[PDB]
């Protein structure tokens, strides 16, 4: 289906002397594939996916050198922003960046991405045209005007439509066996008697990959909207995900309710109900 590549970068300024921490995390199809952390004893980009071992020592040295430069760029940028917002001198602040590309099933570029956050809030974003900028506030407009003047979008557009797409094509080929793999959810219904002659019916979906899933509860083939409790999709910690959806039903009427699980990894949507033990 569709593909993506992202680099999630964070620079955190620390109290007084200790110098900012710089972290860069690379993703291919929402899965971590590389990581750099300035706090490491020997800071370098390291493989985080087994298919990344295919890259020679030169890839890692080049990537590490880019991170060393990025760390310095974020130091200067954090200082400039401190002066725009007048928090000025030596406090604890965050600067974040997201960049990358989205590809179609035909591997053609759908969209380029470039965004910044200061203190976890939107600061400046490159528009979908990859030519113009949207600043979030007055201080970010100083950055926008600086970047409009120096034609910064042009070099970002070149990476996003070029190297970003080119390297993602390479990674998709090298990690083909891994990236194409789906893990089907294993579903079951739990039964939790409560007050007023009612029972909670909980439909669990476990062991699935990717995280994208839909769990629906129906009363005699009719969808149940706001009356349904859901947990946010959560990692199992083994590469798979979990999710559950529950409904409060009257005791004795459990067989009128059905749960359906929709996942790209499934041969067809699952249909299940409370299976009482004998």
């Amino acid at each position: 289906g569709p593909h993506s590549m992202r680099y999630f970068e964070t620079a955190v300024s620390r109290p007084g002397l200790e110098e900012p921490r710089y972290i860069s995390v690379g993703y291919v199809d929402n899965k971590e594939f590389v990581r750099f952390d300035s706090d490491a004893e020997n800071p370098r980009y390291e493989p985080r996916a087994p298919w990344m071992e295919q890259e020679g020592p030169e890839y890692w040295e080049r990537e590490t050198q880019k991170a060393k430069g990025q760390e310095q760029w974020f130091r200067v940028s954090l200082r400039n922003l401190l002066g725009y917002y007048n928090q000025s001198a030596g406090g604890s602040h965050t600067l974040q960046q997201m960049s990358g590309c989205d590809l179609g099933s035909d591997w053609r570029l759908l969209r380029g991405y470039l965004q910044f956050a200061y203190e976890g809030r939107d600061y400046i974003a490159l528009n979908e045209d990859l030519k113009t900028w949207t600043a979030a506030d007055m201080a970010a407009q100083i950055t926008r005007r600086k970047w409009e003047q120096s034609g910064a979008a042009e070099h970002y557009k070149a990476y996003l439509e070029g190297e970003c797409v080119e390297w993602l094509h390479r990674y998709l080929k090298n990690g083909n066996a891994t990236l194409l793999r789906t893990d089907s959810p294993k579903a079951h219904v739990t039964h939790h008697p409560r007050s007023k002659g009612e029972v909670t019916l909980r439909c669990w979906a476990l062991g699935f990959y990717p995280a994208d899933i839909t769990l629906t509860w129906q009363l005699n083939g009719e969808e149940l909207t706001q009356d349904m409790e859901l947990v946010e999709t959560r990692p199992a910690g083994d590469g798979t995900f979990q999710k559950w959806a529950s409904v409060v039903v009257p005791l004795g009427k459990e067989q009128n309710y059905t749960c359906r699980v929709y996942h790209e990894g499934l041969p067809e949507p699952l249909t299940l109900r409370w299976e009482p033990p004998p």
Partner: protein
């Protein structure tokens, strides 16, 4: 001073069975600044061997961490996760509920 309160989910990797080894997860999300302290407790005592995922952030810019520990649940044991963060005046403790 810009702060986002962490959201916490405490849950097992596999459906729990008393006496069977499992993994207890503490999934902490939606927080800012990234500095956080996560403890996992068994019978109200700190568990020493607690794994933490590496610093990561979501599309909305907020930070997240997955803390985990091996555990073998029993009828009498209780498990919890305790989070200390700049956004909270006191640590927040969320107990594991085997039905959630």
């Amino acid at each position: 001073m810009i702060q986002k309160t962490p959201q916490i989910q405490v849950y097992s990797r596999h459906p729990p069975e008393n006496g069977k080894p499992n993994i207890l997860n503490c999934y902490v999300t939606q927080f800012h600044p990234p500095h956080i302290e996560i403890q996992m407790l068994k019978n109200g005592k700190k568990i020493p061997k607690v794994e933490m995922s590496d610093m990561s952030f979501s599309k909305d810019w907020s930070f997240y961490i997955l803390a985990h520990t091996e555990f073998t649940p029993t009828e009498t044991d209780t498990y919890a996760c305790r989070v200390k963060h700049a956004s909270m005046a006191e640590p927040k403790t969320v107990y594991w509920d085997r039905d959630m």
